[PDB]
């Protein structure tokens, strides 16, 4: 019932269930270490108290929160840094970090390090620790009371999710398929974006297979760098996704609205969209609509990768087929219909670096789609001085029309294009955790029928695990709701 | 593996079990409220954490500590403190205090406090509250997280107890059947006397049904004024009894360590009352005490007194009395010693004798140093009326006559009131029994810092005996040394 951000209701409707209700709840769910202790947000904080009631537990912790953070630690201090976790969780003194350490893996370590601060130093260490924290210590942490708070927050996530979750704002725009407009989750004051889908619409243009395939998409990623899918629900009008909320334009709006950018903001741009790809790629995802337009700010500055609707999986040692995405983005195979995995995607970032760069597509001012095609098969893209040698360097690495010898395509991936010396500068490390400012902040821009309800019940699953564990988190409703024998302790 | 005086081992000694290891616990359990909920200090607290949750549980608690401290709060300020929760739980536009209160009672309630704040005025509230508490919220504590902490807390209860959960001290003083020495839990640092009973002796003497009485007597009784006894278990010689250590000596010691034998009455007076609060406790657990004499009350660090030595109490089963010349001779009653039956009337006299020993510096029908043959203490005891001077105040000498009344019919604490005849005296017209009950009233004399440092049958007995933890004894060890504060929090630690 109606009327920072949270509703004054807000203890209430997330207060936690009985125990026994949370019974069915244990048995359904997977008893898998990596996902209940790592990935889910919620499961790894629970997880990690767990730890802190024993030393031994603790030290583990303590010891993989060391190298994640030597990790992201500047080129300059790193050495030190790492020389800071030998001393204190390596020490032929110290207790051993975990049963049976082979001492050999030890001695390498130390003097690898000695040689090299290379980011990858820990990682046979860091395997071992998640070993040894997957068998017992997962076991007893089961078997213990934060595993049955565990259970409570799970029971909370998978509460239904209604209109009456959320307030709704200002329409942020117009979709195919419905509006997009702001919304904000009534329980925790957590701002989104919702994109809603017209069952008339979808039935009419027969769009559900594809309304379908965005949502899934959206929900098995996990990246900083595209769209997430916190909630996907029903109203009697329509389907919901709720998304990240990007409030500062897209690319499309920030170059034309002088046009092109400094080499420092394109890079920063191009670094994150590669980010993106390569979550994306990992999760065997071709996106195939990458264009300036579908490339959204967020309030800080940071991009994401937005509008999934062409993307698609490419089963394991397979290609896909199909000319799709928009006529000056499309790469060379795509336009003679050729088979494809991931290069279309590796094509398109070039083109899009180009037009940060260039203020113009390097194919398409309008011209006819004929001719667009064929200079995008059979004619170079013309560079000015505009271009450092190395931003057209990487240019036509990534615009070259043979996707077998195109950069990212060659064999080694995200990683070729992150190698190429135009982003010299930067730290992918610090990137991809977000620790590094971006070049531009934009405006602080205001707020205020059998086959289809199959497919809606297919569709309308609800929330989404770890963007909505994150969002417990984040509002600091975990914090607050979830701490236990402190209230009324202080006696009368 | 041994070397706030805490083990550093403390917490691993502590560790929680697995959920799934208070299983059987639970279903073992009864499910009774006033207990889970009231009387276990650690359940009392779990069930409160449980009620801060929700709002309306969580204003009933507020209400309750609201009343508790409007009993203990002095007769010039109750008033207003009463007029403060009126105000605050029973508001004609505040919420309802609990479901269905009948609004005649709250009318009641207004307007009896309005001509008098008599410290029952909430007792119908306070009772209803409860009643609320103990159906509907009760159902949800034991179906919450709170409760599967408290099983873990009732598991570590429940864990053996040897020879090796404590540290030994020096010797305290000697018993019938051992030492007494101080002794202090390793895991919680909490200090306690403990007194030994050598298997030996007790199998010798053939004492096994007294010692068992006494542990089973101290079990069941929990007063601030006895005695507690926190754990009982066994060595491979010895039967041990835990108990609360009282250090500032006993009451014969300080009775005469003067030279000039007594006491001021004030000081008289506020032991008089403490003894008086323990045989109320004592006589409500229907258990009659038999050996009340200053020897037998201890002292403790801050001098509040408590009753010690239960081997001659006995429980009196309900509208039955007992027979038997029991005690020590100049203590024991008319009806004692004509070994005439008696519920409970004995431990009023002896009180007497204890008071006017207290004043007179000596005791109303024996000698302090030449003594007298049994038989004429006893014909004294029966026959005679004990001596006043002018040391008693009138007052002081009208109670010690109405307590060493010859005829247990007519004895004040014995007339049909019970203690409360007692604690009316004009004698205690300046103290405040609430208060006295609950700790809250210095004593007169604080003791001197004294030093710590440094077979079928028989083992059927044992097993009767030796049962290890006692429930709220652990249960307030644990809040008092703070282990219960530190272990039981939880989701602050990798947060
Ligand atoms: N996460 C978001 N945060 C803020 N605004 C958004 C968000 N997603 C979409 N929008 C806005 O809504 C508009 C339309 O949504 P968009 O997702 O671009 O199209 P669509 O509904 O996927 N169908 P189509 O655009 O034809 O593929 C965009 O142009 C954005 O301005
Ligand atoms: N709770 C205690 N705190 C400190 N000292 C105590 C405590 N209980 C007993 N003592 C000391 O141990 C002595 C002997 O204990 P006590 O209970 O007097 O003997 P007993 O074995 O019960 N036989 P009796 O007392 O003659 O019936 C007492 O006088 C005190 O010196
Ligand atoms: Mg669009
Ligand atoms: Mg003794």
Redesign the pocket.
């Given at each position: 019932k109606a009327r920072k951000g949270k509703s004054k209701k807000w203890r209430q409707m997330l207060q936690f269930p009985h125990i026994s209700q949370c019974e069915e709840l244990r048995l359904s769910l997977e008893r898998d270490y990596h996902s209940l202790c790592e990935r889910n947000p919620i499961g790894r904080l629970l997880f990690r108290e767990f730890c802190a009631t024993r030393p031994e537990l603790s030290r583990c912790v303590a010891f993989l929160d060391g190298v994640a953070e030597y990790e992201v630690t500047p080129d300059d201090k790193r050495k030190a840094c790492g020389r800071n976790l030998t001393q204190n969780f390596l020490s032929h003194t110290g207790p051993d970090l975990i049963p049976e350490v082979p001492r050999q893996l030890v001695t390498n370590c130390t003097q690898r390090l000695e040689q090299g601060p290379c980011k990858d130093l820990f990682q046979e260490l860091t395997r071992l620790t998640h070993e040894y924290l997957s068998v017992a210590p997962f076991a007893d942490y089961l078997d213990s009371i934060y595993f049955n708070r565990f259970l409570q927050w799970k029971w909370l996530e998978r509460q239904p999710v209604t209109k009456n979750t959320f307030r709704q704002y200002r329409v942020?725009?117009?979709?195919?398929?419905?509006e997009?407009c702001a919304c904000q989750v009534r329980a925790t004051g957590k701002m989104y974006?919702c994109?809603k889908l017209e069952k008339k619409r979808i039935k009419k243009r027969k769009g559900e297979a594809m309304a379908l395939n965005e949502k899934q998409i959206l929900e098995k990623v996990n990246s900083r760098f595209v769209?997430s899918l916190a909630y996907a629900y029903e109203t009697k009008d329509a389907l919901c996704l709720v998304?990240?909320?990007?409030?500062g334009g897209?690319l499309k709006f920030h170059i034309y609205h002088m046009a092109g950018f400094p080499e420092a903001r394109a890079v920063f741009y191009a670094a994150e969209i590669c980010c993106g790809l390569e979550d994306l790629h990992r999760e065997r995802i071709v996106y195939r609509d990458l264009k300036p337009?579908?490339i959204?700010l967020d309030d800080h500055g940071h991009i994401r990768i937005?509008?999934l609707?062409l993307a698609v999986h490419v089963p394991e040692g397979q290609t896909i087929k199909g000319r799709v995405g928009t006529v000056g983005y499309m790469a060379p195979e795509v336009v003679k219909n050729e088979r494809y995995t991931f290069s279309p995607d590796w094509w398109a970032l070039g083109c899009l670096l180009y037009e940060m760069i260039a203020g113009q597509s390097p194919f398409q001012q309008k011209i006819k789609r004929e001719e667009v095609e064929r200079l995008v098969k059979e004619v170079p893209e013309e560079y000015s001085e505009r271009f450092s040698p190395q931003a057209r360097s990487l240019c036509s690495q990534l615009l070259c029309k043979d996707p077998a010898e195109r950069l990212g395509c060659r064999g080694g991936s995200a990683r070729e294009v992150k190698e190429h010396p135009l982003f010299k500068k930067l730290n992918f490390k610090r990137l991809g955790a977000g620790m590094l400012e971006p070049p531009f902040k934009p405006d602080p821009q205001a707020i205020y029928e059998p086959t289809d309800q199959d497919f809606y019940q297919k569709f309308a699953t609800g929330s989404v695990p770890i963007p909505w564990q994150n969002e417990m988190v984040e509002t600091e409703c975990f914090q607050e709701l979830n701490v236990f024998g402190l209230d009324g302790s202080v006696p009368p």
């Open positions: 942020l725009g117009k979709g195919g398929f419905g997009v974006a994109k769209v998304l990240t909320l990007m409030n897209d337009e579908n959204l937005s509008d609707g």
